[PDB]
Design an enzyme around this catalytic site. Structure first.
Site, PDB file in Angstrom:
ATOM      1  N   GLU A  68      20.794 -63.031   5.079  1.00  0.00           N
ATOM      2  CA  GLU A  68      20.548 -61.616   4.829  1.00  0.00           C
ATOM      3  C   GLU A  68      21.715 -61.033   4.044  1.00  0.00           C
ATOM      4  O   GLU A  68      22.821 -60.904   4.566  1.00  0.00           O
ATOM      5  CB  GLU A  68      20.342 -60.850   6.141  1.00  0.00           C
ATOM      6  CG  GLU A  68      18.977 -61.082   6.767  1.00  0.00           C
ATOM      7  CD  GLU A  68      18.820 -60.433   8.129  1.00  0.00           C
ATOM      8  OE1 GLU A  68      19.324 -59.306   8.325  1.00  0.00           O
ATOM      9  OE2 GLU A  68      18.173 -61.051   9.002  1.00  0.00           O
ATOM     10  N   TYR A 123       8.227 -58.759   5.779  1.00  0.00           N
ATOM     11  CA  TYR A 123       8.243 -57.300   5.826  1.00  0.00           C
ATOM     12  C   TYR A 123       7.205 -56.688   4.888  1.00  0.00           C
ATOM     13  O   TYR A 123       7.158 -55.470   4.718  1.00  0.00           O
ATOM     14  CB  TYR A 123       9.636 -56.766   5.480  1.00  0.00           C
ATOM     15  CG  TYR A 123      10.753 -57.419   6.260  1.00  0.00           C
ATOM     16  CD1 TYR A 123      11.223 -56.860   7.445  1.00  0.00           C
ATOM     17  CD2 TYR A 123      11.338 -58.597   5.814  1.00  0.00           C
ATOM     18  CE1 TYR A 123      12.245 -57.456   8.161  1.00  0.00           C
ATOM     19  CE2 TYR A 123      12.359 -59.203   6.523  1.00  0.00           C
ATOM     20  CZ  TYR A 123      12.810 -58.630   7.695  1.00  0.00           C
ATOM     21  OH  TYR A 123      13.829 -59.235   8.400  1.00  0.00           O
ATOM     22  N   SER A 174      11.707 -62.147   3.112  1.00  0.00           N
ATOM     23  CA  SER A 174      11.303 -60.819   2.666  1.00  0.00           C
ATOM     24  C   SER A 174       9.813 -60.555   2.860  1.00  0.00           C
ATOM     25  O   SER A 174       9.409 -59.429   3.137  1.00  0.00           O
ATOM     26  CB  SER A 174      11.682 -60.607   1.199  1.00  0.00           C
ATOM     27  OG  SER A 174      13.054 -60.287   1.066  1.00  0.00           O
TER      28      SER A 174
HETATM   29  O1  LIG Z   1      16.734 -52.945   3.027  1.00  0.00           O
HETATM   30  C1  LIG Z   1      16.797 -52.047   3.871  1.00  0.00           C
HETATM   31  C2  LIG Z   1      16.735 -52.446   5.359  1.00  0.00           C
HETATM   32  C3  LIG Z   1      15.837 -53.489   5.552  1.00  0.00           C
HETATM   33  C4  LIG Z   1      15.538 -53.984   6.813  1.00  0.00           C
HETATM   34  C5  LIG Z   1      14.614 -55.188   7.002  1.00  0.00           C
HETATM   35  C6  LIG Z   1      14.268 -55.887   5.690  1.00  0.00           C
HETATM   36  N1  LIG Z   1      13.312 -55.379   4.890  1.00  0.00           N
HETATM   37  N2  LIG Z   1      12.980 -55.907   3.822  1.00  0.00           N
HETATM   38  C7  LIG Z   1      13.576 -57.092   3.360  1.00  0.00           C
HETATM   39  O2  LIG Z   1      13.229 -57.600   2.293  1.00  0.00           O
HETATM   40  C8  LIG Z   1      14.566 -57.674   4.135  1.00  0.00           C
HETATM   41  C9  LIG Z   1      15.208 -58.844   3.753  1.00  0.00           C
HETATM   42  C10 LIG Z   1      16.195 -59.387   4.571  1.00  0.00           C
HETATM   43  C11 LIG Z   1      16.537 -58.759   5.764  1.00  0.00           C
HETATM   44  C12 LIG Z   1      15.891 -57.590   6.142  1.00  0.00           C
HETATM   45  C13 LIG Z   1      14.908 -57.055   5.321  1.00  0.00           C
HETATM   46  C14 LIG Z   1      16.074 -53.376   7.932  1.00  0.00           C
HETATM   47  C15 LIG Z   1      16.901 -52.279   7.774  1.00  0.00           C
HETATM   48  C16 LIG Z   1      17.147 -51.755   6.506  1.00  0.00           C
HETATM   49  F1  LIG Z   1      18.015 -50.728   6.422  1.00  0.00           F
HETATM   50  N3  LIG Z   1      16.843 -50.760   3.512  1.00  0.00           N
HETATM   51  C17 LIG Z   1      16.821 -49.767   4.577  1.00  0.00           C
HETATM   52  C18 LIG Z   1      15.548 -48.899   4.485  1.00  0.00           C
HETATM   53  C19 LIG Z   1      15.394 -48.098   3.196  1.00  0.00           C
HETATM   54  N4  LIG Z   1      15.311 -48.533   1.790  1.00  0.00           N
HETATM   55  C20 LIG Z   1      16.503 -49.291   1.360  1.00  0.00           C
HETATM   56  C21 LIG Z   1      16.689 -50.606   2.081  1.00  0.00           C
END
Ligand SMILES: O=C(c1cc(Cc2n[nH]c(=O)c3ccccc23)ccc1F)N1CCCNCC1
Length: 357
Positions: A339, A250, A247
């Site tokens: 994930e 990001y 996490s």
């Molecule tokens: O969590 C996501 C998402 C995240 C990601 C990347 C990401 N972002 N953040 C994380 O903590 C994470 C953890 C594991 C895997 C990916 C992530 C990519 C597309 C997404 F749609 N959302 C989509 C974007 C909007 N807010 C709600 C959540």
């Protein structure tokens, strides 16, 4: 006629936080970091209409990318239109033609972020209740109230403190060690009701969600949201990680003198019946029938035998506490780290907010 500003009720840590996540500089930095022309597109000019028009441009762009030489207008031309609506900056050179699924998703991501910056901008708009009143709150107090979200700062002697910290360090990166500073308990009220639905739904885990500072405010206000146009390696849902280091990848770091400040959320997720995949699949919009979540299982997982439990709202919630270990079953997966995926917002409740250096 000279209104009084009342003394701030917030402690220092929470003042810093509220400062940070509403900071105009922080917002402009994020925009610059996304190759957006901040002068040609000021924070106070960001409109939902512009963003909508922005999205339409990407939609049309996609129709051309997926459609085998449809016969319409070229990618070059359609890109120009997008840049016309959403100004970009590349040292005054011609903006790059969007000509690949990767790049198409790149601009969608940015538009989605920009969207939450605008959400934050509209949030600060002065109302009429605030104008008829003869005593205004401290600006920080006011912004904090605009959140409509209790943020209660914890300390060394909080039940869940030694737990969230053990979680942080064991799952984080061994070398580029992330540093805990503050933990806030998050009672996003407005999520409480809809989360009640899954009370019978067991298998609850506390997962990480890394985020750049520009949207943190938006999340503290609306919660985590399944957005249109958002894609990923596991489709269209809300992503969580059990390993902190996943996490934090990001969490874009913002400078403050000598240190890089960052904020991460911990979420209570009702996973229920898990569906384990070991291959990419960007087309999923729900789990398979009978399943409540999908979990892209990585090569390693926090040692499950080191798991512990907290009690949040009467519910046992699983908290990983061990260093990642190999999962022989998924040694050949396409995912290095897990994930976790849910496809309905209601299966997720924000519990904790962290500051790291
Ligand atoms: O969590 C996501 C998402 C995240 C990601 C990347 C990401 N972002 N953040 C994380 O903590 C994470 C953890 C594991 C895997 C990916 C992530 C990519 C597309 C997404 F749609 N959302 C989509 C974007 C909007 N807010 C709600 C959540």
């Amino acid at each position: 006629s000279m209104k009084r500003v009342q003394p701030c009720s917030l402690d220092p840590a929470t003042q810093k936080l509220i400062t940070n996540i509403f900071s105009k500089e922080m917002f402009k930095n994020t925009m610059a970091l996304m190759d957006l022309d901040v002068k040609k597109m000021p924070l106070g000019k960001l409109s939902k209409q512009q963003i909508a028009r922005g999205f339409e441009a990407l939609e049309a762009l996609e129709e051309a990318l997926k459609g085998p030489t449809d016969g319409g207008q070229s990618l070059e031309e359609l890109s120009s239109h997008f840049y016309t609506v959403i100004p970009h900056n590349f040292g005054h050179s011609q903006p790059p033609p969007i000509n690949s699924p990767e790049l198409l998703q790149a601009k969608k991501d940015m538009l989605l972020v920009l969207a939450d910056i605008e959400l934050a901008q509209a949030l600060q708009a002065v109302s009429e209740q605030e104008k008829t009143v003869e005593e205004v709150p401290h600006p920080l107090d006011r912004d904090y109230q605009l959140l409509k979200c209790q943020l209660q700062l914890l300390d060394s002697g909080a039940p869940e403190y030694k737990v969230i910290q053990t979680y942080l360090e064991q799952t984080g990166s061994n070398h580029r060690c992330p540093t805990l500073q503050h933990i806030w308990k998050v009672n996003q009220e407005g999520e409480e009701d809809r989360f009640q639905a899954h009370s019978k739904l067991g298998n609850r885990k506390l997962l990480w969600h890394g985020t750049n500072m520009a949207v943190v405010a938006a999340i503290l206000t609306s919660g985590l949201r399944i957005m249109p146009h958002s894609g990923g390696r596991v489709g269209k849902g809300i992503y969580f990680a059990s390993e902190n280091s996943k996490s934090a990848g990001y969490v874009i770091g913002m400078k403050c003198g000598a240190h890089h400040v960052g904020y991460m959320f911990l979420g209570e997720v009702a996973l229920g019946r898990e569906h384990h995949i070991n291959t990419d699949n960007p087309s999923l919009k729900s789990p398979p029938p009978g399943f409540d979540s999908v979990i892209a299982r990585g090569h390693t997982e926090p040692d499950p035998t080191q798991d512990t439990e907290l009690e949040l709202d009467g519910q046992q919630v699983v908290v990983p506490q061990g260093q990642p270990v190999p999962c022989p079953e998924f040694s050949s997966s396409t995912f290095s780290q897990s994930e976790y995926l849910i496809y309905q917002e209601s299966q997720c409740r924000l519990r904790y907010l962290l500051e790291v250096h």
